[PDB]
Design an enzyme around this catalytic site. Structure first.
Site, PDB file in Angstrom:
ATOM      1  N   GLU A  19     -13.476  18.335   5.895  1.00 48.98           N
ATOM      2  CA  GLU A  19     -13.878  17.334   5.217  1.00 48.98           C
ATOM      3  C   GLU A  19     -13.320  15.870   5.346  1.00 48.98           C
ATOM      4  O   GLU A  19     -13.171  15.985   6.324  1.00 48.98           O
ATOM      5  CB  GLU A  19     -13.508  18.387   4.115  1.00 48.98           C
ATOM      6  CG  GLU A  19     -14.540  18.593   2.984  1.00 48.98           C
ATOM      7  CD  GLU A  19     -15.400  17.930   1.965  1.00 48.98           C
ATOM      8  OE1 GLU A  19     -15.224  16.990   2.142  1.00 48.98           O
ATOM      9  OE2 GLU A  19     -15.197  18.626   0.716  1.00 48.98           O
ATOM     10  N   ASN A 173     -17.222  16.270  -7.921  1.00 56.95           N
ATOM     11  CA  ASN A 173     -17.582  16.233  -6.008  1.00 56.95           C
ATOM     12  C   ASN A 173     -17.148  14.715  -5.673  1.00 56.95           C
ATOM     13  O   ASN A 173     -16.467  14.532  -5.511  1.00 56.95           O
ATOM     14  CB  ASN A 173     -18.574  17.334  -5.419  1.00 56.95           C
ATOM     15  CG  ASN A 173     -17.178  17.469  -4.305  1.00 56.95           C
ATOM     16  OD1 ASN A 173     -16.702  17.208  -3.325  1.00 56.95           O
ATOM     17  ND2 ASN A 173     -18.084  19.493  -3.993  1.00 56.95           N
ATOM     18  N   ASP A 230     -23.117   9.541   1.090  1.00 58.03           N
ATOM     19  CA  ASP A 230     -22.494   7.973   1.031  1.00 58.03           C
ATOM     20  C   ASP A 230     -24.203   7.577   1.030  1.00 58.03           C
ATOM     21  O   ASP A 230     -25.378   7.912   1.572  1.00 58.03           O
ATOM     22  CB  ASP A 230     -21.915   7.794   2.726  1.00 58.03           C
ATOM     23  CG  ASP A 230     -20.955   7.338   2.839  1.00 58.03           C
ATOM     24  OD1 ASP A 230     -19.962   7.563   2.323  1.00 58.03           O
ATOM     25  OD2 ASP A 230     -20.428   8.920   3.526  1.00 58.03           O
ATOM     26  N   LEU A 271     -20.388  14.074   4.930  1.00 57.88           N
ATOM     27  CA  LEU A 271     -20.809  13.153   5.272  1.00 57.88           C
ATOM     28  C   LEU A 271     -20.769  11.253   6.004  1.00 57.88           C
ATOM     29  O   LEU A 271     -20.010  11.312   4.753  1.00 57.88           O
ATOM     30  CB  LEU A 271     -22.392  13.025   5.120  1.00 57.88           C
ATOM     31  CG  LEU A 271     -22.747  12.651   4.550  1.00 57.88           C
ATOM     32  CD1 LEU A 271     -22.786  11.762   3.720  1.00 57.88           C
ATOM     33  CD2 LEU A 271     -24.304  13.418   4.707  1.00 57.88           C
ATOM     34  N   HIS A 272     -20.565  10.629   6.554  1.00 61.23           N
ATOM     35  CA  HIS A 272     -20.259   9.889   6.800  1.00 61.23           C
ATOM     36  C   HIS A 272     -21.020   8.891   8.410  1.00 61.23           C
ATOM     37  O   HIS A 272     -21.220   9.085   9.319  1.00 61.23           O
ATOM     38  CB  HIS A 272     -18.664   9.595   7.415  1.00 61.23           C
ATOM     39  CG  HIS A 272     -18.178   8.387   6.649  1.00 61.23           C
ATOM     40  ND1 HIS A 272     -17.824   8.130   5.296  1.00 61.23           N
ATOM     41  CD2 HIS A 272     -17.269   7.096   6.954  1.00 61.23           C
ATOM     42  CE1 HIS A 272     -16.958   6.878   5.249  1.00 61.23           C
ATOM     43  NE2 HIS A 272     -16.889   6.679   6.466  1.00 61.23           N
ATOM     44  N   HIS A 285     -19.594  23.600   6.652  1.00 65.18           N
ATOM     45  CA  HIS A 285     -18.182  24.762   6.068  1.00 65.18           C
ATOM     46  C   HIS A 285     -19.121  26.474   6.634  1.00 65.18           C
ATOM     47  O   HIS A 285     -17.721  27.197   7.231  1.00 65.18           O
ATOM     48  CB  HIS A 285     -17.885  25.223   4.928  1.00 65.18           C
ATOM     49  CG  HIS A 285     -16.978  23.609   4.324  1.00 65.18           C
ATOM     50  ND1 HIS A 285     -16.454  24.033   3.464  1.00 65.18           N
ATOM     51  CD2 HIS A 285     -16.204  22.985   5.196  1.00 65.18           C
ATOM     52  CE1 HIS A 285     -16.260  22.518   3.110  1.00 65.18           C
ATOM     53  NE2 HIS A 285     -16.081  21.706   4.402  1.00 65.18           N
TER      54      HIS A 285
HETATM   55 CA    CA Z   1     -18.290  10.044   3.550  1.00 66.64          CA
HETATM   56 CA    CA Z   2     -15.680  17.558  -1.429  1.00 66.43          CA
END
Ligand code: CA
Ligand code: CA
Length: 312
Positions: A19, A173, A230, A271-272, A285
Site C-alpha cells: 500500500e 479510505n 490520485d 496508486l501514485h 493485494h
Molecule cells: Ca497516491
Molecule cells: Ca487505503
C-alpha cells in the site's frame, strides 16, 4: 463505458498488503507493508524500493511502546524530505528518510483519542487531509469501521492542529484534494469503500469543509470498492476499485466513471504518479506486488513538488 488495457510492468513483489506508494522530493520510491506480522502481532514496515533492480530495503518498522504499526498510506512533505504516514494502529507518523520516525498526535484538537488512519493527501496550502477507518489507536484494541459507521476524517493544519472534520463513515479510505487553476483548494474527495460511494466536500479553508455530497458511484457488486486515488494533470480522478480488477477514471465533475482501466490482478489497492511523467505505480493485494503502467497524461503535481518560494 470504455475500458483500456495498458501494459503493466512488474516492479517488485512479496510485500504483504502492499500500500501507500509514494515518491519523496529526491525521486526515491517508497511503499508500505501493513500486513507484515510477528507472532500474531502487527509489525508493518515502510520500504524504499530501488526502481533499477526492484530490490527492497526496510527503512522503518514503526512501533510505539511495544505496539507495532500498520502503515497504510503516505504523502511527501515539501519543506523537508520526510514522509507523513497514515498508520491504522499508530495514527499519523512523520518518517525521516533515515528511518527515524515520530508519532504526530495521540489526541485531536477536541482532546479525544486519535483514530487509526489509512490514507492522506496534502492540499497546496500544506494542510494534510486524513481518512481514519480504524477505531482508537494503540494501545486500544484494534477495530475497523467495515460494518459500523465510526470512521472519521481529519485535517492536520499547517499550524499543527489535528482536527476531526467529520465522522460516521463506513471505512473512509482513499482521499484526494481538487485544486482550482489558481492553485486554491476547491474540493475534498473521500472514498467510502464498502458503500461503493465517493463523497465530496467544498473546502472553505483549513479544516473547514461543508456541503457533503455523493460525488461518484463505484461500479460492481463485488466485496470491496474504492481504495486509493490520485488526480492527473487534467483533474481526472483515478480510483483503485479493490476487488473489481479495475481502476476507475472519473472526470472533474464526478458521477459515473468516464472510463475504466483493466488490471491483470483483482485487488488494486493504491496508486501514485512518478513526478513529471505519465507513469503510474500501482500496489495490489492479489499478489502483494507493485506494478507500473503508462497513463495518457502526467499526474497532478503533489504538494511536495510545489515550490514555497516560487514566483509563478
Ligand atoms: Ca497516491
Ligand atoms: Ca487505503
Amino acid at each position: 463505458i470504455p475500458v483500456i488495457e495498458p501494459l503493466f510492468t512488474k516492479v517488485t513483489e512479496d510485500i504483504p498488503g502492499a500500500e501507500g506508494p509514494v515518491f519523496d522530493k529526491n525521486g526515491d520510491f517508497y511503499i508500505v507493508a501493513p500486513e507484515v506480522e510477528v507472532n500474531g502481532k502487527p509489525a508493518g514496515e515502510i520500504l524504499r524500493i530501488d526502481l533499477k533492480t526492484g530490490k527492497k530495503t526496510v527503512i522503518c518498522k514503526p512501533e510505539v511502546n511495544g505496539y507495532g504499526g500498520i502503515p497504510a498510506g503516505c504523502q511527501c512533505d515539501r519543506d523537508a524530505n520526510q514522509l507523513f504516514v497514515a498508520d491504522m494502529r499508530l495514527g499519523l507518523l512523520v518518517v525521516q528518510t533515515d528511518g527515524t520516525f515520530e508519532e504526530i498526535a495521540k489526541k485531536d484538537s477536541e482532546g479525544r483519542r486519535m483514530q487509526g488512519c489509512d490514507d492522506c493527501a496534502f492540499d497546496y496550502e500544506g494542510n494534510l487531509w486524513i481518512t481514519a477507518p480504524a477505531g482508537e489507536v494503540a494501545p486500544a484494541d484494534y477495530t475497523r469501521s467495515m460494518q459500523e459507521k465510526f470512521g472519521s476524517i481529519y485535517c492536520f493544519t499547517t499550524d499543527g492542529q489535528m482536527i476531526q472534520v467529520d465522522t460516521a463513515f463506513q471505512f473512509p479510505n482513499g482521499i484526494a484534494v481538487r485544486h482550482m487553476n489558481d492553485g486554491r483548494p476547491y474540493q475534498l474527495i473521500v472514498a467510502e469503500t464498502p458503500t461503493k460511494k465517493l463523497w465530496s466536500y467544498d473546502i472553505k479553508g483549513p479544516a473547514k469543509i461543508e456541503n457533503k455530497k455523493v460525488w461518484g458511484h463505484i461500479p460492481g457488486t463485488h466485496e470491496g470498492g474504492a481504495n486509493g486515488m490520485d488526480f492527473d494533470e487534467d483533474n481526472n480522478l483515478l480510483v483503485a476499485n479493490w476487488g473489481s480488477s479495475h481502476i476507475e477514471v472519473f472526470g472533474p465533475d464526478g458521477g459515473q466513471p468516464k472510463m475504466r482501466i483493466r488490471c491483470p490482478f483483482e485487488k488494486p489497492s493504491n496508486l501514485h504518479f512518478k513526478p513529471q511523467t505519465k507513469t503510474i505505480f500501482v500496489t495490489e493485494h492479489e499478489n502483494n506486488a507493485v506494478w507500473k503502467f503508462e497513463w495518457q497524461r502526467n499526474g497532478k503535481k503533489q504538494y511536495c513538488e510545489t515550490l514555497k518560494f516560487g514566483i509563478f
